[PDB]
Amino acid sequence: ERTTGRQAQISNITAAKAVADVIRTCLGPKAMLKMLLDPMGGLVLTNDGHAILREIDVAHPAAKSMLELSRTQDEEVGDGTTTVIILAGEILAQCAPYLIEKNIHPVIIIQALKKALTDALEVIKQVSKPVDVENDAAMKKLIQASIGTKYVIHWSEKMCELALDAVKTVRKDLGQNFEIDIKRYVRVEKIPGGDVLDSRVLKGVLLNKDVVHPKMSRHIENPRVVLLDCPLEYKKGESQTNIEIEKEEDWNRILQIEEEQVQLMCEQILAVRPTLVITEKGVSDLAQHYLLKGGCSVLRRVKKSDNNRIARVTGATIVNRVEDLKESDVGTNCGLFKVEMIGDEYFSFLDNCKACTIMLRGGSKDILNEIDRNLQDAMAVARNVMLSPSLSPGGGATEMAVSVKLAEKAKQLEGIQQWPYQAVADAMECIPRTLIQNAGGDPIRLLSQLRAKHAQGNFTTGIDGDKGKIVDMVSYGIWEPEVIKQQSVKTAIESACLLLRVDDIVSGV
Amino acid sequence: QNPNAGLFKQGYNSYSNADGQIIKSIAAIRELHQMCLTSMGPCGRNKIIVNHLGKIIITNDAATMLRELDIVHPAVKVLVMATEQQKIDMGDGTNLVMILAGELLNVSEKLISMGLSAVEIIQGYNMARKFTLKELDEMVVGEITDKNDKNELLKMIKPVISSKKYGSEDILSELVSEAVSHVLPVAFNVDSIRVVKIMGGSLSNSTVIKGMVFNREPEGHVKSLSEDKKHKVAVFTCPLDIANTETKGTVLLHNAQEMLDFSKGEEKQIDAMMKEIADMGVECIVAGAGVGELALHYLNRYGILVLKVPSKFELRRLCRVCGATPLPRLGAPTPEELGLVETVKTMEIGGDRVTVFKQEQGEISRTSTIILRGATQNNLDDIERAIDDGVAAVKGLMKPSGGKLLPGAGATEIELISRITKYGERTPGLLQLAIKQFAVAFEVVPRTLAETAGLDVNEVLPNLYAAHNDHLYKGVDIDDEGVKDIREENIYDMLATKKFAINVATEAATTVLSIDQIIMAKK
Amino acid sequence: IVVLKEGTDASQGKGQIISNINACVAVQEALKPTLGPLGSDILIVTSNQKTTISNDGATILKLLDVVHPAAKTLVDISRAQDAEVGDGTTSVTILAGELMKEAKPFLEEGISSHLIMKGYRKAVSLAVEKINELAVDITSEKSSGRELLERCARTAMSSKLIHNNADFFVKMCVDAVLSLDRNDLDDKLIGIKKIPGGAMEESLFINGVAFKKTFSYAGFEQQPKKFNNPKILSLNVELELKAEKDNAEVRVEHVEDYQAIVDAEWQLIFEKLRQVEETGANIVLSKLPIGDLATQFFADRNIFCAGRVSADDMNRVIQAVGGSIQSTTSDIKPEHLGTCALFEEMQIGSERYNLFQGCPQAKTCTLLLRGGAEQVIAEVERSLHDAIMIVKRALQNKLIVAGGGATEMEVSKCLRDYSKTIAGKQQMIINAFAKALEVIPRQLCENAGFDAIEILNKLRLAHSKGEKWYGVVFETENIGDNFAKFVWEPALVKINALNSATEATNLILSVDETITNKG
Ligand SMILES: Nc1ncnc2c1ncn2[C@@H]1O[C@H](COP(=O)(O)OP(=O)(O)O)[C@@H](O)[C@H]1O
Ligand SMILES: Nc1ncnc2c1ncn2[C@@H]1O[C@H](COP(=O)(O)OP(=O)(O)O)[C@@H](O)[C@H]1O
Ligand SMILES: Nc1ncnc2c1ncn2[C@@H]1O[C@H](COP(=O)(O)OP(=O)(O)O)[C@@H](O)[C@H]1O
Ligand code: BEF
Ligand code: BEF
Ligand code: BEF
Ligand SMILES: [Mg+2]
Ligand SMILES: [Mg+2]
Numbered sequence A: 001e002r003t004t005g006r007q008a009q010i011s012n013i014t015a016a017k018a019v020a021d022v023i024r025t026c027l028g029p030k031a032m033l034k035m036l037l038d039p040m041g042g043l044v045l046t047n048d049g050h051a052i053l054r055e056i057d058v059a060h061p062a063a064k065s066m067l068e069l070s071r072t073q074d075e076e077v078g079d080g081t082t083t084v085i086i087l088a089g090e091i092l093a094q095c096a097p098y099l100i101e102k103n104i105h106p107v108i109i110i111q112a113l114k115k116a117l118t119d120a121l122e123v124i125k126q127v128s129k130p131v132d133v134e135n136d137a138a139m140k141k142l143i144q145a146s147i148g149t150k151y152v153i154h155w156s157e158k159m160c161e162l163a164l165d166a167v168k169t170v171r172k173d174l175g176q177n178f179e180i181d182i183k184r185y186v187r188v189e190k191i192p193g194g195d196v197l198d199s200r201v202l203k204g205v206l207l208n209k210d211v212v213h214p215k216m217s218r219h220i221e222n223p224r225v226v227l228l229d230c231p232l233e234y235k236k237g238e239s240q241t242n243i244e245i246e247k248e249e250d251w252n253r254i255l256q257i258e259e260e261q262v263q264l265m266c267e268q269i270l271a272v273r274p275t276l277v278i279t280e281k282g283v284s285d286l287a288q289h290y291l292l293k294g295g296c297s298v299l300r301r302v303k304k305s306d307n308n309r310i311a312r313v314t315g316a317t318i319v320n321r322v323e324d325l326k327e328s329d330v331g332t333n334c335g336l337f338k339v340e341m342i343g344d345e346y347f348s349f350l351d352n353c354k355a356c357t358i359m360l361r362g363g364s365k366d367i368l369n370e371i372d373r374n375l376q377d378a379m380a381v382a383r384n385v386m387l388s389p390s391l392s393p394g395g396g397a398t399e400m401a402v403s404v405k406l407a408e409k410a411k412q413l414e415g416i417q418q419w420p421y422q423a424v425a426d427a428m429e430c431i432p433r434t435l436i437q438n439a440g441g442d443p444i445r446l447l448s449q450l451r452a453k454h455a456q457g458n459f460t461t462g463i464d465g466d467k468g469k470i471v472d473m474v475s476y477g478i479w480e481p482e483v484i485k486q487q488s489v490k491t492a493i494e495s496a497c498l499l500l501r502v503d504d505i506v507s508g509v
Numbered sequence B: 001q002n003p004n005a006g007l008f009k010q011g012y013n014s015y016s017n018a019d020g021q022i023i024k025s026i027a028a029i030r031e032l033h034q035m036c037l038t039s040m041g042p043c044g045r046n047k048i049i050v051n052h053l054g055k056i057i058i059t060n061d062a063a064t065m066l067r068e069l070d071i072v073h074p075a076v077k078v079l080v081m082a083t084e085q086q087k088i089d090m091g092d093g094t095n096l097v098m099i100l101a102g103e104l105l106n107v108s109e110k111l112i113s114m115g116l117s118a119v120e121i122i123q124g125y126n127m128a129r130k131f132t133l134k135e136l137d138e139m140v141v142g143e144i145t146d147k148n149d150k151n152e153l154l155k156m157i158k159p160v161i162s163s164k165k166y167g168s169e170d171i172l173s174e175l176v177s178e179a180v181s182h183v184l185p186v187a188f189n190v191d192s193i194r195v196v197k198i199m200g201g202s203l204s205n206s207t208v209i210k211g212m213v214f215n216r217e218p219e220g221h222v223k224s225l226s227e228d229k230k231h232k233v234a235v236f237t238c239p240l241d242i243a244n245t246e247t248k249g250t251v252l253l254h255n256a257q258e259m260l261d262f263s264k265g266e267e268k269q270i271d272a273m274m275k276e277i278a279d280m281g282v283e284c285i286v287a288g289a290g291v292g293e294l295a296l297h298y299l300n301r302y303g304i305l306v307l308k309v310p311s312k313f314e315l316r317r318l319c320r321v322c323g324a325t326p327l328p329r330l331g332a333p334t335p336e337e338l339g340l341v342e343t344v345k346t347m348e349i350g351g352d353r354v355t356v357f358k359q360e361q362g363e364i365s366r367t368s369t370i371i372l373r374g375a376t377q378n379n380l381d382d383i384e385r386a387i388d389d390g391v392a393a394v395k396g397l398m399k400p401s402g403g404k405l406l407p408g409a410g411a412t413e414i415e416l417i418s419r420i421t422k423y424g425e426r427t428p429g430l431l432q433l434a435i436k437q438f439a440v441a442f443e444v445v446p447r448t449l450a451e452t453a454g455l456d457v458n459e460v461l462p463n464l465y466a467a468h469n470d471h472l473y474k475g476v477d478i479d480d481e482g483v484k485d486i487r488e489e490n491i492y493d494m495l496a497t498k499k500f501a502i503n504v505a506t507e508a509a510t511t512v513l514s515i516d517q518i519i520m521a522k523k
Numbered sequence C: 001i002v003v004l005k006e007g008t009d010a011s012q013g014k015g016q017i018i019s020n021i022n023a024c025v026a027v028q029e030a031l032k033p034t035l036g037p038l039g040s041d042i043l044i045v046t047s048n049q050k051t052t053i054s055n056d057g058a059t060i061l062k063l064l065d066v067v068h069p070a071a072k073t074l075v076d077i078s079r080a081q082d083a084e085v086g087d088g089t090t091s092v093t094i095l096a097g098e099l100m101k102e103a104k105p106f107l108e109e110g111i112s113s114h115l116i117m118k119g120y121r122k123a124v125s126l127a128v129e130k131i132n133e134l135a136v137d138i139t140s141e142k143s144s145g146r147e148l149l150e151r152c153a154r155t156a157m158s159s160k161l162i163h164n165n166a167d168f169f170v171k172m173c174v175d176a177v178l179s180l181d182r183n184d185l186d187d188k189l190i191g192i193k194k195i196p197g198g199a200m201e202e203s204l205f206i207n208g209v210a211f212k213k214t215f216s217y218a219g220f221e222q223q224p225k226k227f228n229n230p231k232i233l234s235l236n237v238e239l240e241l242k243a244e245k246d247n248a249e250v251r252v253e254h255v256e257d258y259q260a261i262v263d264a265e266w267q268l269i270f271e272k273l274r275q276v277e278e279t280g281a282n283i284v285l286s287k288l289p290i291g292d293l294a295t296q297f298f299a300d301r302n303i304f305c306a307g308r309v310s311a312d313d314m315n316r317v318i319q320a321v322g323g324s325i326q327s328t329t330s331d332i333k334p335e336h337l338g339t340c341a342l343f344e345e346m347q348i349g350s351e352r353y354n355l356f357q358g359c360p361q362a363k364t365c366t367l368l369l370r371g372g373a374e375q376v377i378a379e380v381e382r383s384l385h386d387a388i389m390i391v392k393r394a395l396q397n398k399l400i401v402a403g404g405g406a407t408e409m410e411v412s413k414c415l416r417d418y419s420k421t422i423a424g425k426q427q428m429i430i431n432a433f434a435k436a437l438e439v440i441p442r443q444l445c446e447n448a449g450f451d452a453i454e455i456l457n458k459l460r461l462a463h464s465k466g467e468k469w470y471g472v473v474f475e476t477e478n479i480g481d482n483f484a485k486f487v488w489e490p491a492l493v494k495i496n497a498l499n500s501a502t503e504a505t506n507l508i509l510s511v512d513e514t515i516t517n518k519g
């Protein structure tokens, strides 16, 4: 029913702490795969944090708040998902003692944490170095960084390629910020089989819809594309259109009219001399015929999302009513119209030998979803940099810097206001630690050394994954988008600050 | 859908520590810790525990609460065990074993977090413990001169009674130090201080008699004896009547003579047995065994005050009041076996009649009784729990130099923090961590005393700290301004107690860390 | 997945302490009406099915079952009050509760309980001494020996079903506290008897002793049923042929032996039997049987008897005719027997009652009670024990205080005045207890109808402004000198009351976590 007092507080903290506990063995280069079972049927074999926590229903309110943190974070940057959860926990946990043990009110611990966040954020931008968003080589060895710790690493280079080759493709600066809608303009397409490398980033689209009529062009050299909303069949009246006939030879009259309007429609289209007509709706058998000899291949039923991406790699602006069909609505700038038959399943291409279609190949419909998600992380950190050319010391280095500059300051602040501040510092340290642990090396040992080396000797010094020894980032490098280090710490400290505002929990609508 | 593997036993529950079990347990302990953390100190509170058979209980003491509860968590039962050691093997300090054993495991996870091994934290804790017993042997300020002088006793029992029953802290300890002296010779047994209680008035009427009081009545018309010194008394294991034969034993009669004569025959045979003893001067015979009909009848004539006391544990502690000796058979009451009683009358206490057995000087007693008066039966019980707490601590100051003593009010504890840490950053290696933690642990005794006193702990704690670094008397001002001084009130926890505790808490807390897997079964 | 208690409720927190208070308040408000001269009364029909009606607050709080730990202490302190004193039981709880009530403000505002506990602690100490300080000891200070026991058994017998027949019972009450040795006042001697029927005052005070009529044997109806100075034989055992119990085996091989052993049995009895006759007695009583033949015998020679007398009766029988129990018939000497002034076998309330009335040498009386219902006789016996027990503790302590709210109201004064000199936390707490005492005067007025507010407030002026015995004129609703009006109660009540009441109050304020186990 009800639970006021530290009772509340505790269960919240423990709850939140437990959330972390699950995916903590998923943060690191040697991170394991949490094969989860969804209710609907299938499975999820991913190790990408947010993709795990999504597939786990929780009860305790805090555990629900803690769980959605991984989502809002997966919405800002594509990466840094697992990290925010672990941090968001350790913060609450590291407050636990001064929260009750040292009887500090939640207002005070909040007043400090909100303060320690800003200072902490400084130390992030302080250690961050900028980068050439255009230097293909830098972007690659940047995207590569956030491809490690995932099944997609055995082709790491191959991945950053398909990543950049797609981030830049749908990009479109615009200024009067840079707009990169990976979502609506980079439709992926996972096709079972082949090899990983056998996957490319076609600059166009790929529909499996075949051709409306047999004897129709399998591939127009340079096709003239015409995209339209409206269907291709005899329309009807949006009023009480009811016909009364007693005039004998009138049946034939009307029944004919239908053929007649389908004709007109074919005309208006055929007019601008098209070779490829792709409509979102249907295609009357009649209309097929008049578009056959009219000289063009037809494609019926294609999703809006599928269509509007075509209209960016054909230029062919989509148009509804045909009696208004302009000639500006061309089909210029569009290579071939291949129709490769991929294992008993016909496809259609529209490459040009603004929106690309990443076509992945692996070894199962299952294995592909691993790739797709892994790729998304790549293609997202690429976008981040595109809109914030700043990077942060990976290997948990940044995380340790903030640990010290804060630890130092806290110790030199004096007042009850110090303890909560001190905790944010002590908290931060958990990431290089989770890393060192999931590496196998001795946490107490490596950290003391990493922390010390940090205290003076440079701040771009994190821990090396497969190794387990402290290395300098600059050295073997593994910087990550500075944006990630923003959110991870922004919302984590917020989460903590929210849950700490709770002193009572109640049940009933 | 989900499979399940490696199972062939029966339906148990195995909590592998590699599943963050050590902490699951710290939790369970953490919960019962908060219950004891507010019962310690004079500023402690009580809890009303309601029996699994339905009986009310209210007690400040810790080993008692835990006893009356239905604990179930294996890692918790372990610390409840240590609270037993303390109550049995010391009677006092039961509360401090909990608070530390728990607090040890609390500041213990901080270490486990870093990466410190289980075995490493254990070792460091023991290393810090043995080191902690050393200082206590020398942190010791005064030591009672083993004087055992009644007034010297009140200096010891008073701090034990406060923080259990704070308020009548003196009216109590005085009331017991007076019961103990009456039995302590001139160049100890806890049993020699039987305690009685009865509803009526308040504690201000509580008393101390040089002998026990009994409920039942004198049996014969012999109501209550005289008020002139000395009364010859005879105790009996045997019942007052014609003995019988363990193998059957039926009266047979072949001829009417046998009968007519057997009748009055046994009649006077009883008189015979009675007579002869009444003769040896006796006038009060306490019957641990039954008492025949004719038997008491004759004795009634000889003004022999009787007193059925079947309680073989009462009868024995009774003889040690008068001086008499329990006599297995009946008939040969040697003038040596007999004892002397100054008073053996019947007083009404609280409305009901009870028989007494004291002495006003002559014939000293080795078993006194503390008659506690009260109104609430409940409370009145927690008092008899305090009377035991003190007595237990006195029987402990005996023979092997138990007088030793260090500052109470946690003053000792604060010193112990620094002193254990001294050893902390002094020992090389990573053990230095655990040893330092073991020290922090000792901050519960002070902090809670302040916390329970409504004092802002964040103020009393640093205050009491800087006030400790000649003067390691500064403790927690139970009642004000900053801290206060131990010496300012002649209050301190003797060594024997607080030391044995730290050792039991360190065992408890350590065994809990040695378990790196648990298995249960359906009940 | 693990647990620590197996589904067994247990609450804690600051509310926990407040729950308990309010809990007690209930059990408290329950008795508030049964207070004062014009006090309401209760009718409890326990799950037992036994229906009772009374005012002994103890008796009510005993029939309420009550299981709440906290609120259950009010049941305890009420029982003790009916022990160490015998009266005031109703009030010990009204106060005990009321204090806990006045502790709420602090506990709520956010004050330590250990401080409220201290505050009340002094408050009692001071208040207790103040009573001792007013405990008007007398002896012939215009009070007389009887007028103290009367004047005190009276006021205390007020507010009980036995009221409008006061005089009758107070004269009866005192007479029975005196019946026993004033050197050792033992209630167990005033043994009471209840008789179905009759007026609630057609009750009889036997001077000697009265008891049932266990006389369950043939051959009765002979034996005079009345003697003046009979020779009472307070015998203890048997008087049956074959014996009522115990035996052995008789084995004989001779026909004559058979008839022989028989003639022996008989003579064996008859002898012991004449042995009694020999004592020259008129009344033969025994805590054991008196067989058909036995009682038949005495019947022949005009000797009266009764077998199987109540154990606690023979002891009052001794104390009346001054006999002395005898187990055998052999060494029966004459200082052993006893004699009264008059013996008769009544037919009171359709029930024959053997009674040895008139005994100027007794140390134990007996009194039969009457009533139109087994509930009223029952309430009398309890309304009278509350009086007898107060007369008794008024011999042993000729120290008295005028209640009717006065003592209570005054002890407030000095306590409220004192708090001025303290200032601060202890001020409010000790000043609270002062106001908390006003409950007895307060309630006493509401129960009867008097203007609780004005009569109280008007009392505070005059009482604090002098008159240390101003209380409430039960008559003309107005304040007045209750000492002058003769509303006396031994100080032994109030002193025990405030001691024992507060005890409860801090016992509760001390508990922060109540763990009820289930099972
Ligand atoms: N190559 C590596 N070596 C050491 N640390 C790495 C390496 N790769 C990722 N990191 C660090 O681990 C974290 C990224 O791990 P990851 O498992 O990808 O979690 P997320 O889902 O948040 O990306 C960051 O702190 C990053 O600095
Ligand atoms: N008068 C007091 N003032 C300050 N501390 C006291 C006082 N009396 C006893 N204490 C403290 O009581 C503490 C022990 O708590 P207690 O409730 O007595 O449990 P136990 O004695 O069973 O461990 C000791 O640390 C002692 O310092
Ligand atoms: N004659 C009276 N006039 C005014 N007050 C009285 C009188 N008789 C008894 N009282 C008061 O009434 C209260 C006693 O209430 P009662 O109903 O008798 O219960 P109890 O005596 O068991 O508390 C006390 O304050 C007592 O002083
Ligand atoms: F592992 Be993260 F989501 F890239
Ligand atoms: F509670 Be302890 F034994 F004083
Ligand atoms: F009800 Be009380 F005992 F006069
Ligand atoms: Mg990543
Ligand atoms: Mg103690």
Ligand SMILES: [Mg+2]
Pocket: C087, C088, C156, C157, C386
């Ligand atoms: Mg009364």
